[PDB]
């Protein structure tokens, strides 16, 4: 890869953007290889848990500034979305900077957010005669209703701060800039030191069940939590936890 | 009771979990003590309001780690969690210490939430193997995406603290440990201060707008609003306020 | 067409509208209703107007309320003084001067931006003089967590929530010194105005429209307003300036 | 015992007769309270696998005849005579043996199938009398297309759906010779109570709940059912049944 | 007087007819605006209780004029691009304001009824046809998505019923027995009583309490929002507002002295 | 070569065959392997615009036969069986009903655009009648027949069957074919819809469908953006033209 860095380490892929002299702005080629990433990770057995992560000032700066005949083409352009409707392993973004426009992206559909006390956030689409759509009804899900529309219209003229974020919790945490990918990897570890499948449940169990009212969220939730039940890994669970240990996982 | 006590002054009734030796974990005995005392207090007309909370460290450790011939058999486990489906009365929580697993139910579905300087907030249940489907489905609308989700797959490695909960608004208050029972029942008697059927018509007119979109939303408070219009308290409130004295609820 | 209980001013691209009963702490009478609606009406009309400010006089931004069934409004829950957000494209931003409470909180959760004076408070007192709360607290509860939302509910007039804990959890985006609150306004006006108006409505409209449907649905939902702005003028205007280093001049169209 | 209905179990089906034939089969108060003590007997005794809904005479049921809060049911719509589809999973069957009108409807909409005898007429009059029917005609809404809906709700009184439009449209699956009504709807009843009961009721289950959200959802909604469903004996019995042709024994479990 | 349509008031019915026949009632950018102005003139006349609709000749609607397709995409209104509210949506063309309008709307559909005519038969309360009716959309046939209208038609008939309209464009029309069988249509009438049976109706609606009417049908479209048990609890607001009138009164009043009601619409 | 069903392809129409008739095209894993290829094949050849699916015999599809364990994303969701992608395809799908159609057969009828059936076909499932569940299936049924009409046929198991004339009556069919005639008669409604602009049909097919899961007028605004992706098209612009100047359209699927 040219713009991105990929590596694993035990059970967790890291994706880097790797364009700082452009802010780490997302380029056709940039998306064409983070798409190429994430298949990598869905498809690589011994990857549980994708972290997400850029390189400098920003960690991504939004988009850089035949027709119909794929499915893709009638929905919103998904430019560099993690592919959160169709991949069930767990995704960690670590907002290393500036995150503006597309970048939004990773802090509202990933599962773990965190970021450098250095990160700021915005959209600066209104400021260049166009619409942010796909972006904002994404943050319109993480921030409250006035703080989401505020972003929206105040376009590239106001940025929020990380410490705001946290306020309202569009992030989790705020660590010392330098330590930023050390404690990405090592809340990985933590996730990663539960049971996959389960954890791959729960996240379905809330995702699908943010789409309906609450009492049907609840019935829907019932299907993952009977699936996850055949595992071996859920008949090995319960003894381990008695006994205070942590076992070796099989993710079967 | 042997598990759980219930007392009823003036017009609270207050269940207090009274396991501290397993930590108030829920057992089957627990469970069937606690619905008992809910439906004591659904039906003695003289009580308006149920503050529930625990004993020592723990609020509540979680559950204890004919088939479909009854049709609760047909959703999902309930366990402690009070009624507030078929229950028109408010439920105060007051959160003692931990708070985890099952002991979310009374966090997410109760009306007024507060919480000992003590208190922590967290799920095991990926730990042990397992989904956590109804008590997540649960988290998932009081904390934003990221943070219920982080509180998903963390298990049991991560505590939210009362502080964070309180930024959230996860919870309403934080109180010192000592004054926890005396606070609970403080707001508890300020709340018996108003007409308790507007109570419970605003309280229904909210739980019951959250599952339809905003707009039939008010149009269903309506309802609720005109049946409370012809109470006899309804009158009363303007009336009191005339004569500069103060109302005289009957609930009626 | 000349207000007893507001003021209407427009400056540029904004219009002001003022609450201005302050006698009676700006309580909406159906009078104040009726000339509300009308300032509402004749901001989303007027092209000149981009961005309507509301905002009270006094101490209190708004303390609330004070042939049958011949006219449609009369069959669904009456709005009082909330701004037609349902059926206008322009934006709107609250600027809470003091006491807000009762139908007062229709502009706070209805509204695109909602700022405060660091002297505001946010309450409801319907269930203490026995009545419900029905939209104002179903539309609350859109905004503040669920039991903030049901608290605020219960305790009627006997406690308020400041400014402080409003700004917490996000109810207002921010709190400004009292004595600077409509110059705050307006500045955050003229911001929200110095970018490209169609697409500051079509931004709305796509949060808007998208709360009602899930998530998924609400990004194709979307496209249609991106699509609409894109034909504009102004959509190519502002990456040209961009590209050139220099300040868009916008048209609207 | 009952003196406005009849309640009989016979095998595993239980048969609610309304019974005031004299009175067209109006809903007192009375009967209300009878019908809901039968009902809470069909669902608790374990003999009873399915409910039987019937009338007698001319009318099926002509309708409602023309402390306060203090219980949860007063904060919804009065239920009348509905059986309680919500809270019970055994299966309801309904044979209209005649008029069927206001309150009447339903049974023909909250049960599970519904029959009618060639005489049967369907209608709601409560526009004729000033009143609106809400929970009735919502139901409807729900059964008949759109503007059949609207125009039985608007014509009250005036006019009536025959048993055979009723049936074109799928408001009822099966028309009667009218003497033979009670045989055939017992005939039914045999038939779903020769399947596996638990089946039944978790495949009704999937259907009603997965109506109130899209289908993708409602699709993995209703694999719950269908795994609490596997798990029973008698999901063990019907394929070795069939393995070993012979016909399967139902336990219930 | 409107130049595209008639508008004409008897008693408590107003009746709007659509007359452009030599066009077969296409809609222009004229016939809309005028439609507009005599659906607001029907909701704001007190003594108006319901709305007729119906076309004259071989066309009930035909459509909007295809020679009025833009040819830049810009949906034409009165004013400049994007600076209506109306723009941000679908063009409602010739649709009754049926979600801000509480007075029951009937359409009896006298001949071809596509396109953006078949906007009567989803979003009205009463539809009757002419045996010689016929339903279809052809915007596949002209290379163009039929949004709105489609998607109404499938809040009305089955699945792969709307659907094989939708694909099908012009290339086949369901007859009046097909949309009576499938409830599309509530009656199919004789050809040249159409007009005579629409009133009858009409005055058979008209007969009840109108704000018991205009209470029920809110109760009906508000309910279809959302599921079952919440239309149940919404409609009883609707309910509620009507116990409050005089005619809810004079009603069951009337019943028990044995007399006939009198409505006052208060 | 597919085993359990056939592929042609003809013109714009793919037609897919179920060709098992000695199991009564009952789905095996194996035919559904091979269904599952055939359908994205189907979706990525471009010639193809449209794709038919029939059967062989006495039968349509007389339901199913009696990988690490959630390692693949489609184990956390409801078992497919035969259904063809509706949700990730555009291309429209007519299916053609041979005969007997019960179980998993009926997903052809419930997720497919057009469907036709032979007089001799008929409708049901069996499950209940041997203690299971039928949950995709019958949640998809009460989409397409009203409320207790669905409930009955889920209630009666086997021992009911819908008629095609029933079927035709409510809609859960558009049309009854003279039997020797049916394959005829799908080829035929293919070539007309194929005779439209495709964008425009698939288009109009997603507003529909994808307007079906919110309300009405978040549909009505929704179906905007499959409108204004189709203004674009070349094709959006020869068809109106084509139509004033009374002349038959060229479409180029572009």
Not at 9 to 24: F, K, Q, S, V, Y
Not at 25 to 51: C, F, G, K, Q
Not at 81 to 86: A, G, I, K, Q, S
Not at 127 to 137: D, K, M, P
Request: aromatic share 6%; charged share 25%.
């Amino acid at each position: 890869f040219d713009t991105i860095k990929y590596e694993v380490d035990g059970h967790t892929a890291t994706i880097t953007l790797n364009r700082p002299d452009a802010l780490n702005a997302l380029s056709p080629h940039m998306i064409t290889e983070l798409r190429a990433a994430y298949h990598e990770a869905e498809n690589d057995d011994r990857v549980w848990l994708l972290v997400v992560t850029g390189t400098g000032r920003a960690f991504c700066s939004g988009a850089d500034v035949p027709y119909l005949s794929t499915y893709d083409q009638w929905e919103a352009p998904q430019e560099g979305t993690p592919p959160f409707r169709t991949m069930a392993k767990p995704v960690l973004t670590a907002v290393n900077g500036i995150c503006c426009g597309a970048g939004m992206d990773w802090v509202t559909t990933t599962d773990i957010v965190i970021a450098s006390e250095q990160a700021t956030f915005f959209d600066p689409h209104v400021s260049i005669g166009l619409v942010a759509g796909r972006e904002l009804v994404r943050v319109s899900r993480v921030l409250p209703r006035s703080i989401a529309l505020r972003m929206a219209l105040m376009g590239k003229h106001e940025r929020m701060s990380a410490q705001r974020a946290y306020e309202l919790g569009l992030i989790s945490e705020i660590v010392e800039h330098d330590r930023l990918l050390e404690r990405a990897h090592e809340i990985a570890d933590i996730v990663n030191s539960n049971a996959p499948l389960a954890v791959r449940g729960t996240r379905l169990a809330i995702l699908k069940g943010l789409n309906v009212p609450l009492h049907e969220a609840e019935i829907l939730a019932e299907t993952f939590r009977e699936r996850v039940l055949r595992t071996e890994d859920a008949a090995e669970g319960p003894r381990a936890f008695v006994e205070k240990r942590q076992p070796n996982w099989q993710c079967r």
